[PDB]
Design a protein around this nucleic acid. Structure first.
Ligand SMILES: [Cl-]
Ligand SMILES: [Cl-]
Ligand SMILES: [Mg+2]
Ligand SMILES: [Mg+2]
Ligand SMILES: [Mg+2]
Ligand SMILES: [Mg+2]
Ligand SMILES: [Mg+2]
Ligand SMILES: [Mg+2]
Ligand SMILES: [Mg+2]
Ligand SMILES: [Mg+2]
Ligand code: NA
Ligand code: NA
Ligand code: NA
Ligand code: NA
Ligand code: NA
Ligand SMILES: [Sr+2]
Ligand SMILES: [Sr+2]
Ligand SMILES: [Sr+2]
Ligand SMILES: [Sr+2]
Ligand SMILES: [Sr+2]
Ligand SMILES: [Sr+2]
Ligand SMILES: [Sr+2]
Lengths: 186, 95, 154, 160, 140
RNA sequence: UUAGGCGGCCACAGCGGUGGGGUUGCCUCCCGUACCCAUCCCGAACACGGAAGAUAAGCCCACCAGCGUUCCAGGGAGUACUGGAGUGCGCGAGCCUCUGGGAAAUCCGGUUCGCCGCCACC
RNA sequence: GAGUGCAAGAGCAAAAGAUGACUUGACAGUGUUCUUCCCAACGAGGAACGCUGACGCGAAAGCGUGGUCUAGCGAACCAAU
RNA sequence: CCUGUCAAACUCCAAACUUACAGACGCUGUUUGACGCGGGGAUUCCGGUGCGCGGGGU
């Protein structure tokens, strides 16, 4: 920018979307990456592999296409995250993918976070992924219990639209139960 | 030379042009080569580890297996055969 | 196709330059050879440019020299039309000369020594200390120029 | 010391003051003479002294020639005549002398010189058509004090 | 268009640059929340050689804690034109700084895909004076 | 790709500027702290929960060349320098001819306001 | 352009720098290769890269075979351990 | 802004040229066995000059 000698960062570094130092350490495993990403409203999980002209996504799952199996709840929470991971995980198994390493991008490794929920989901789908159980939220929270008990302090329905008043972690069970099922159109 | 260390007279060859300064892209540090492949040897100023002796910059050897993540590349120094341990970060496929 | 004639001896000439002449089958002063005009050969003659005389000869001249100085790969045997006819893919010297000039074959392929051992230039040459443009005999010549030399070294 | 000792360019450029100490000061008093508040474009005539051979000119010679030239312009045009002259080269090359025989001979620092390539302008003066023959005379005296033969060339000027 | 352009108070930083403390207590009571020690850099002749070591304290107020503070803080100073920043900030006073900005400032404070706020969307001295002045007090 | 995710090359992509775009869609800003988690002080950030509002930021789309950069034509320049050769010139430092290569500054007119790969998606 | 212990040159910015916390991989064993000594034989020393064992930290990939890289080093006999 | 100059231990630029590997042509080798491997025997470790490029020194 200033002159001939000026040094402009790599594009994805300017955009502040790719931590290249973390990326290298990640790519060293030689395994595919389980890309866990978040949006204010959605959660995405991708199984990316290295390629000659750029990465290759062999399977993915977006919280949006979660409804395609019977999801009538919001898509920016724990139950949403876990399920999206499981879906992507299952699709991954179908593609022949057997193992991966969790890539959480610029998100923080906070215990019980959603990226770890995504990870737990993928692991349950049958994917072998280096993890640490006690960094994963305890079952109930993944189910969405923390949200139900929150709506208990009602007086005003947590959810605007009507999915339900006291919400349902039971819906979480139905959807998971539905995915672990062999049939299911992936 | 006034000294005989490994970096004597390596001012130019081990220095980046200002614009190529800074951490290098990971893609080439992870590249995979097969036994028999011809590879050009050139140290990347920005990459500290996995280097070979500077005297060998410019060689084009033959990958003949690996040691850990580094590669074992065969070359001919003048008339003598030598095996060089080097990581992909400092290698490029020929052609 | 160019005609190469070494006009300057080996003493004191760079070794890589001497080795080049040897790869072009010339090992003595006044020895001539016929070389195709390729990028590979072009570099070689350019490197020897200062110890040789070269250029494209005329059909007739090549014929005179072939008759007078061509030789079998082995032996004394004169290389006349009959010889050419009973040993080569051609009917006479002219057919051979033409094919060489048109670069379709080489003296070797036809069982001939790659070298034409010429005689010193009758009347002397223009000197080996200057190129053609300066009045000397070194370097690239005119077709008429090469012809004069080759004919003189008949 | 004779100039024969330093006039040729037979040594590496030696100018890095970060590695050389005790360099004698320059004897050149001025590089811009005459009316330095005026421009060169404000004059019809521009004459330069051109060096015909590549050489090194010690600061002692520059000053002597610059002096004998500007000193003439002063005498003929006045301490404020309407003219301006410039010595465009600066003595960057540091000079040594080995003043123990050839043992540890690297010389001690003794001076500075300017490297001038043949065909370059050492001096360039600007004057009016009237004082054209005076500047030519100043240069004649100037080239009698520097090693090489020179050409007095009239650049901007055709009133002949 | 206006709703997402009208100024706001991101933070009010109250701090006392002492030089060696017992002052934390007052800031805590006048602000309503815990104070923070302040270390220093570079050694100084004024018996200030100890690099890392208490020298001051500050408190960053956000939301109500800030307004409820300014309501009784602003009335203590005589805001002037020069006393304003170029980004649209002003510091008066024990120091009391007020950081003002528009709605989408987070864009430059978040971790992912952060970005610097365009000049057009940056607050101005004038735009600031107005906003503030437009709330219990006078300018210059 | 009517706004997304992961990238490769790593300024042709930078700097700066103009215009346009979003009812249950996307990204955001945004709203909000019971929880997982968090601030040597602040739900600012990080983390979690969520849609009342908005397209003003970001982002995506279209475009401008003033600065920086890439490449191209002409000029500078076959100049500077240079591998091979010379009973060519010069008192000499050095130069010239033949042969094979061949710049840089700079001027001028164009180019460049990214290109490409994988996945997902009215 | 700072900083990174010390020459000089080089490397480094969501770090190789700064702060904070934790920790002792400045670990034992044994190699490959380069260097020392271009080419081309030659010791001590050095470095890079492995494996086996045991560990530290991290969610994990991973990092740690001392200090970002090139100086900071010593045979046999004998003694002590 | 304008205007005057430089660098062995400066570089936004940048040759000629030297150099690793590969293919092609040339030359060479398969009875003259190359390339390479193992073994016996040395001599040698005062050099000099021209040219090109140097560094020191009048
Ligand atoms: Cl994300
Ligand atoms: Cl090595
Ligand atoms: Mg050098
Ligand atoms: Mg014969
Ligand atoms: Mg006679
Ligand atoms: Mg004669
Ligand atoms: Mg707009
Ligand atoms: Mg002479
Ligand atoms: Mg003893
Ligand atoms: Mg002892
Ligand atoms: Na780099
Ligand atoms: Na002595
Ligand atoms: Na403290
Ligand atoms: Na917008
Ligand atoms: Na050793
Ligand atoms: Sr000399
Ligand atoms: Sr003279
Ligand atoms: Sr908030
Ligand atoms: Sr003389
Ligand atoms: Sr050309
Ligand atoms: Sr290290
Ligand atoms: Sr060389």
């Amino acid at each position: 920018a200033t002159g001939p000698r000026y040094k402009v960062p790599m594009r994805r570094r300017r955009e502040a979307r790719t931590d290249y130092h973390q990326r290298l350490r990640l790519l060293k495993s030689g395994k595919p990456r389980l890309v866990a990403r978040k949006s204010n409203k959605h959660v995405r999980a991708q199984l990316v592999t290295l390629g000659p002209n750029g990465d290759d996504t062999l399977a993915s799952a977006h919280s949006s296409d979660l409804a395609e199996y019977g999801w009538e709840a919001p898509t920016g929470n724990m139950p949403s995250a876990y399920l999206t991971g499981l879906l992507a995980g299952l699709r991954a198994q179908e593609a022949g993918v057997e193992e991966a390493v969790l890539d959480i991008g610029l998100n923080s490794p906070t215990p019980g976070s959603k990226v770890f929920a995504i990870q737990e989901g993928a692991i349950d789908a049958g994917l072998d992924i280096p993890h640490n159980d006690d960094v994963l939220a305890d079952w109930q929270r993944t189910r969405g219990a923390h949200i139900a008990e929150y709506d208990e302090q009602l007086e005003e329905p947590l959810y605007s639209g009507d999915f339900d008043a006291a919400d349902l972690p039971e819906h979480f069970d139905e959807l998971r139960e539905t995915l672990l099922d062999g049939d299911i159109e992936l | 030379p006034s000294s005989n260390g490994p970096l004597e007279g390596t001012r130019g060859k081990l220095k980046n042009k200002p614009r190529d300064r800074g951490t290098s892209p990971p893609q080439r540090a992870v590249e995979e080569f097969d036994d028999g492949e011809k590879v050009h040897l050139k140290i990347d100023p920005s990459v500290p580890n996995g280097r070979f002796h500077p005297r060998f910059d410019g060689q084009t050897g033959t990958v003949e297996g690996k040691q850990g993540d580094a590669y074992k590349v065969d070359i001919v120094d003048g008339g003598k055969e030598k095996t060089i341990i080097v990581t992909a970060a400092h290698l490029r496929r020929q052609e | 196709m160019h005609a190469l004639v070494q006009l300057r001896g080996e003493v004191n000439m760079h070794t890589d330059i001497q080795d080049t002449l040897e790869m072009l089958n010339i090992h003595h002063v006044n020895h001539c050879t016929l070389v195709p005009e390729t990028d590979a050969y072009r570099g070689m003659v350019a490197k020897v440019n200062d110890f040789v005389a070269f250029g494209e000869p005329s059909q007739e001249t090549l014929e005179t020299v072939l008759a007078t100085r061509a030789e079998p790969l082995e032996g004394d045997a004169d290389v006349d039309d009959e010889w050419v006819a009973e040993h080569t893919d051609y009917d006479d010297i002219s057919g051979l000369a033409f094919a060489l000039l048109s670069e379709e074959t080489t003296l070797r392929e036809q069982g001939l020594s790659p070298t034409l051992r010429l005689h010193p230039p009758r009347g002397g040459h223009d000197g080996v200390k200057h190129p053609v443009k300066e009045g000397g005999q070194l370097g690239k010549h005119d077709t008429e120029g090469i012809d004069d030399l080759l004919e003189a070294m008949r | 010391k004779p100039a024969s000792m330093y006039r040729d360019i037979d040594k590496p450029a030696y100018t890095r003051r970060e590695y050389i100490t005790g360099i004698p000061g320059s004897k050149i008093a001025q590089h811009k003479m005459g009316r330095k508040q005026k421009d060169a474009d404000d004059y019809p005539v521009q004459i330069s002294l051109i060096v015909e051979e590549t050489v090194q000119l010690r600061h002692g010679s520059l000053e002597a020639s610059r002096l004998s030239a500007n000193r003439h312009l002063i005498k003929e045009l006045g301490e404020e005549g309407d003219y301006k002259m410039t010595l465009r080269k600066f003595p960057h090359q540091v000079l040594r002398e080995n003043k123990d025989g050839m043992r540890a001979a690297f010389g001690k620092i003794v001076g500075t010189a300017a490297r001038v390539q043949a065909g370059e302008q050492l001096f360039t003066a600007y004057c009016n058509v009237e004082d054209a023959e005076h500047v030519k005379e100043a240069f004649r005296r100037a080239y009698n004090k520097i090693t090489p033969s020179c050409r007095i060339k009239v650049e901007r000027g055709e009133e002949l | 268009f206006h709703e997402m352009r009208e100024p706001r108070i991101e933070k009010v930083v109250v701090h006392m640059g002492i030089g060696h403390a017992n002052a934390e207590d007052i800031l805590g009571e006048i602000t309503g929340q815990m104070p923070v020690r302040t270390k220093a850099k570079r050694t100084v002749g004024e018996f200030d050689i100890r690099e890392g070591d208490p020298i001051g304290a500050k408190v960053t107020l956000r939301d109500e804690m800030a307004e409820e503070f300014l309501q009784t803080a602003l009335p203590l100073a005589e805001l002037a034109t020069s006393q304003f920043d170029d980004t649209g900030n002003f510091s008066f006073g024990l120091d009391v700084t007020v950081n003002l900005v528009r709605p989408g400032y987070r864009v430059a404070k978040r971790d992912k895909a952060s970005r610097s706020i365009p000049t057009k969307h940056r607050l101005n001295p004038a735009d600031a004076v107005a906003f503030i002045e437009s709330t219990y007090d006078v300018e210059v």
